[PDB]
Symmetry: C8
Amino acid sequence: GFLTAFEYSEKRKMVFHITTGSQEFDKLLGGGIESMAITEAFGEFRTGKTQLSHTLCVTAQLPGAGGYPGGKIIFIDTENTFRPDRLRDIADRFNVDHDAVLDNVLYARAYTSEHQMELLDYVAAKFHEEAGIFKLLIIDSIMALFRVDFSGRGELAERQQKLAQMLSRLQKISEEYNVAVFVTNQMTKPIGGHILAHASTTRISLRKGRGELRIAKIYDSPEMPENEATFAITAGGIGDA
Amino acid sequence: GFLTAFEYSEKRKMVFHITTGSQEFDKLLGGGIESMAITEAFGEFRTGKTQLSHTLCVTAQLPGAGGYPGGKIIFIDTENTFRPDRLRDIADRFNVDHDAVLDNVLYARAYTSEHQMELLDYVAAKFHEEAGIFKLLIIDSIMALFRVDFSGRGELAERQQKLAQMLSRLQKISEEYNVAVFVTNQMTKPIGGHILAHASTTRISLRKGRGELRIAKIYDSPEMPENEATFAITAGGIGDA
Amino acid sequence: GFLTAFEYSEKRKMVFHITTGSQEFDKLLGGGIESMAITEAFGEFRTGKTQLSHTLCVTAQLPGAGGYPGGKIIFIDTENTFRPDRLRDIADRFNVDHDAVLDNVLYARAYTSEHQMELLDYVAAKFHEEAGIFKLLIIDSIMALFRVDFSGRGELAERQQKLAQMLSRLQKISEEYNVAVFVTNQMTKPIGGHILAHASTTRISLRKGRGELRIAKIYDSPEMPENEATFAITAGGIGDA
Amino acid sequence: GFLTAFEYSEKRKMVFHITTGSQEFDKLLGGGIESMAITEAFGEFRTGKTQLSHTLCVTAQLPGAGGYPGGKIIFIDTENTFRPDRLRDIADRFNVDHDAVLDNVLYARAYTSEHQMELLDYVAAKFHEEAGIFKLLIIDSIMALFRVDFSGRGELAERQQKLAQMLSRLQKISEEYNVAVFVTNQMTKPIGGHILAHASTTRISLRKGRGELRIAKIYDSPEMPENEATFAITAGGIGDA
Amino acid sequence: GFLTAFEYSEKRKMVFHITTGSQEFDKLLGGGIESMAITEAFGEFRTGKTQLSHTLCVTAQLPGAGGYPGGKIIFIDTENTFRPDRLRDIADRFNVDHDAVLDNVLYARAYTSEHQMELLDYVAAKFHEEAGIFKLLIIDSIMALFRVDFSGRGELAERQQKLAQMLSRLQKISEEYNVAVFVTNQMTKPIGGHILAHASTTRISLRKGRGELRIAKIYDSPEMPENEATFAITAGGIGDA
Amino acid sequence: GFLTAFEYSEKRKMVFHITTGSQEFDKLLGGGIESMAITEAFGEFRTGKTQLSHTLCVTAQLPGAGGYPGGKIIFIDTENTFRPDRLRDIADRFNVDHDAVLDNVLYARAYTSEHQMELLDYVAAKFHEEAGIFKLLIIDSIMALFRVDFSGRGELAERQQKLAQMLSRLQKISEEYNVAVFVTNQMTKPIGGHILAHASTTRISLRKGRGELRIAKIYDSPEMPENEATFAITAGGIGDA
Amino acid sequence: GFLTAFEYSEKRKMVFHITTGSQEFDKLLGGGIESMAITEAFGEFRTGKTQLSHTLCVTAQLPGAGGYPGGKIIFIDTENTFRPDRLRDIADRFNVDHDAVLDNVLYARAYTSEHQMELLDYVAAKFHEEAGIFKLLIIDSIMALFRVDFSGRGELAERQQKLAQMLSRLQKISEEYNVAVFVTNQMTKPIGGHILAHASTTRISLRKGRGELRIAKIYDSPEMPENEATFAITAGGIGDA
Amino acid sequence: GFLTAFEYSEKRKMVFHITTGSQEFDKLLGGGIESMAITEAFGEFRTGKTQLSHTLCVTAQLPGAGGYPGGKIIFIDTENTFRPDRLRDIADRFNVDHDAVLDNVLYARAYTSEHQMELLDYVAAKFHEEAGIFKLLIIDSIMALFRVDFSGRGELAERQQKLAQMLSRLQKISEEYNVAVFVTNQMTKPIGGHILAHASTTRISLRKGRGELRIAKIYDSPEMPENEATFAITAGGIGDA
């Protein structure tokens, strides 16, 4: 179950970043959404969690920095807010055929906790079946169904086991198959306590701004600026200033 | 269990809206009550919840915006308040035969929580028998029976599983058969907690202005005029100004 | 389990009101005690719950407005306050033979919760056995035995199940057989919480007045007058001013 | 299990009252202790509860108002306070042979809760052996034994079922065999909660005036003189002024 | 299980009182410790509970008022304070041989709750085996062992059952065999709550006085004098002034 | 299981007292430590509990007041504090051979609660082997082991049964074999609650005066000089002034 | 299981003290660490618990006062702080070969509660296998593993049983085999409540001083000096001033 | 299961220290990270926990003080933060081939609590395969996974057994195979309670000075400069001033 630091280093040579579509957002992430990791984005009422989701369905398809070839995406929706129509705009911003974009994204709704966990079994199996093909796993959103199946607090032990059973699979998939995984989450402080904090390597908070300007901070300070970043929402998705 | 975002797009090209009978109310809703989704209206007593329900029994039959051909409705009454006679008056406002309108609405009373969920299984299979014939599924109201078979504060574990079961079924119904589902609900904020909040993809608060005038509002604000709309109750159902 | 709104409308053509004996009381009820429904009356110490009970045993027998032929009544007593002698007066006020009146009312005492539920099985079965014959089911009073068999509050889950099991049968009987059902209830706010509030379509509160004057309000406001009504108690039962 | 209100009326024509020995006390009661009902007297220590019990042992034997022929009594003593010698003195006041009076009262001590309920089964079957011979059933006192086999505040679930069992039996006895049942009870308001309140159809509070003078009062007021009466205790039992 | 009031009266003709040795104490008891009953005496630290115990072992042997022949005594000791030597003095005060006195008293120590209950089975059986022979059953003290076997308060249900099981046997023995039973009890208000209050027909409190003077009050007032009595402790046991 | 109070008297003629070595202390006790009883001494640290224990190891051997012939002792040590060498010094004060004294004391350490109770069964049977040879049974101390195998406030149910078992055994031992039992106990008032209070028939509180001077007191006062006594600890054991 | 006080006295002739290396410490202990007993030493953060431990590994090997020949030691370490290198210094202070010292000490680490209890079985068995050979059993520290295996307070019943199971074996070993047992313990007041207080015959507290001076008090006062003692820590272990 | 303190000494002659790369930090530690022990570093975010971990991956390979030959490392990552690329930079500072260094570190990710403990069993057996080849075992971090599979305050019973199991294994590993084990841990004071405190034989707190400067401190003070040390983080790992 070990491998040498050399063999692991070989493995990390192959780590890619997928661009968010904001140069400013990307610097703050050291290139973009990092593979072999979970990146988590949260925010209240109406932050750009979901605009980021749609934007990555396109940008993950594109050759990017560092010799990233682009590839396929998987999309699990628990919010019933995925809309293929939104991608066709973002596609134009990036000058690629909408048809081909919409082909390279696999989509499933999740309706229960359990369902959501079953979908991950399938996605793991599918990544296994041939590799280097899929580059992103998006889950929008990560825990909402867990709040739903296990409300009140005599239930909490169980939610915790299940939720953790599931984020440990997420981590594994991520690392085992070299995909970036991006998840959204809501707030009550983000939900999911220690269990979710531990699973995600990068946590990003999201807040509003001068109209359509928006603010990403690496959650948990320091109050220093270069730990933050400004981007806008637009017809063509996540962009700059 | 996935499909490509292209296949999904093909499936959403068929999404429709059932006008509420208010141009103001419709605008708020991006056209009216939406397919492949649950719309929930909650409000005080005497607010349009039930008036809206009756109205939709007719407007769902009307050919409409977006290519919407009109179709049949299924109505589940937990409140003992459905009145085929209101439909006659509303049918007049829309210039349509009473008998025909009343022939196109299937109706059942639900007397218990369990009963309510057995009615869904029947509705589900009815939709499966021929696709496209039914367009709307009204439940008036969604959760009264659950408060009924489950109150006294230390009992929600059981209620909550059951409620969540039904609402995941509803979503699946909704999305799988391209129908709009529309439900009313009571207050204390709205009842149902996270479970119900999650399941409805649009939630409308209702309250009254001067007499016949009522106000509709997307729950969770914001205090922008674009998120409120004004309508009136008449002999002919939900109407304008 | 559905029927069309047309077939249901047919069914509602046959809905009757039984007069309370107060023209003023009747307006407030839109004709009287409505069939296919539960009407609930509550009030403290010594309100006219029980005078109303006796009055309906006679007025339900009489041809009334809307082509109502009159018919038979069933009377379940949990209070041990039914008194056939009282009916003989009310009979005189209405000019009909006391013998015949006393013949058209079926009477049973209930001594336990369960007993009360067994009596309803029999009454359902009896309505089934030939129809159009019975027009009223009176239960005086609705829940008193449930307070008795399930006092203290480790018992409450059970009371709730039983009580609700029973009001769901009541609703069904009502609707299935087109009878009016009238029940009395006492106060601690009426007893029975959400369970009883939901089951009864019409709730009437009762308070005292200028000697023998008495006051019915549709429970839960608005503080508007036409939601209220004045009647008197007399030798001949419920009457006006 | 029903009868017609005519059959019931025939059955109530036989209802009787056993004078208390006070014209004032009787008036309060519409003639005295009533058949087909449970009358409960509760009071402080030293109030007439027991004096009333002894008195009725004799007055139940006397031919009385309303056609009442007089008959035999069954007396159940939980208090160890019955004294055949009091009856001798009371018999003198009514001009009746001691032996005869003492021959017409059947007596048992109850030593436990369970015992008390086994005595009822015996009484029930005794009444069934010949109808009309027994007229009164006194239990002095009703619930002392239940406080005894069930105290410590977290134990009432069991007590309450048992108590309710017995009191439903009592009612059935009472109504089925046309007997008056009369019971005493203790204070802290009266003990017994809803269970006992429901079962007694008339409840009398007792308290003392100047020495030999005692006051009786229908429990639950109102503060009207017509609901209070004054009596005296003597060597000859409950008497007037 | 019933008998007639006449047959019961026969039975009560045979009720005797055993003199306490205080004329003043006796008036307050209406002749002395009454047969067919439990008489209970309590008091703190060092009241004359135990001097009364020893005195009755002698006075119960003596012909007394009302044609009482005297007879045998049973003595159950839980306090390890019975001392035959004390009786020899009291014997002298009454001029009877100490030998014969000490012969007419049966003695057993009780070391546990259960033990104490087993001793009563034997005593009942012994009274049965021939009657008219034993006149007193003394238990010193009544409940002390119950406090011991069931300390803390998760135990209380059990203590209550056992304690009540036992006082119901006591009552029965008393009544069934026409013996006086006298028991002592200590204080925390006496111990044993409703259970012991109910079982004892007569309760006497005991307090100190002008040196060796002592004060008996019928427990529970009224604050009237003739409900009290003064006696002294002496070489010869309970006496007057 | 009873005997006559004459037989009992014969049995108490043999009751003895073992001098404590203080004339003051003895007077308090009516002669010293008593047969057929448990005497309990409790006190602070450094009070004579253990000094008294050693002393009695010798004085129980001495011919004494009342005809007391002297005999053997059994000593159970839970405290690991018995010191045959103290006895040598005490033996000198009484002018008795060390070896003989040390030969007449049987000794065991108890290491657990259970162990302590198994030692009793052995002692019991030893006393039964020949009557009259052993005179004293010392347990130093009575309950330390019970606090040890049972602390944490929610565990006493089990401790208390066990403790009560042992102390009922002790009493039976005590009374059946005419031995004195003498026990020490700790403070916090004394430990042991009602259980221990009941079992000891005399309880002595101990505390110190100026240095070598200690004060003994019957627990439960009263503040009379006759209930206190003064003694001294020396090389020769408990002594006077 | 008893033996005579004479045979026990024989046994106590053979009780030895092992010198701590502080003449001042020794006086306070009446010669040193006493055999047939548990001696407990506690103290905070960094007291000389562990310097005492190492010092006894050497001084127990040396002929001392009272004809003590010296002998072998057993050392159970739960702290992972035993260091044979420290003994080689202390050996020099006492002028004995380090080799031979290190040979006469048996060492084991304990890693769990249970483990610690298993080690004692072995040590008992080893003492049995030939006697007079081992003179000390050191456990450093006594309870730390019990805090570890049973943290939180739903666990406490269990810890208590185990801990007490174990100190009762300790006491037995001590007494049965005539070894001194010395244990260390930490503080939250020392840990282990009544259970550990009872098991140890001598308890010593330890505090800091004028640099390397250190202070032993017999735990639990009196505030008198001769209940205290000053010693230093040095290259050669526990010494004086 | 014991060995002689001589055998133990032979075993400790082989104890080693792995330099941290700071002369100040090493001095604090008596040479660096120690064999046969667990050293735990805890600190805020951004403190050297992880920098130290990377550094040791290299310094454990270097021939060192005390005869330390250098050897291989096993690294268990719960944090997803190991970066073979840092080692390259650190390897440069020490003038050592990257490949060789990376070949000598065995690495595994742990994804659950259980997983983490299964990795130990594997490590244990790996050490057993050839002794002396591995020198260091790093767990980064020790307990994150235990907070993860066990939070919500009423669940620690289970967590705590498991945690304690693993840490007793660790100690045994540590001591049996002469390896240093080094672990990081998080704050809230450090997490882990008594269980973790007991298992680590040295605990270091970490916090930062001006930028690159960090401060190390033995947890549990004292506020003496000798117990603090200052180091710096660089491209070349933990360094000096």
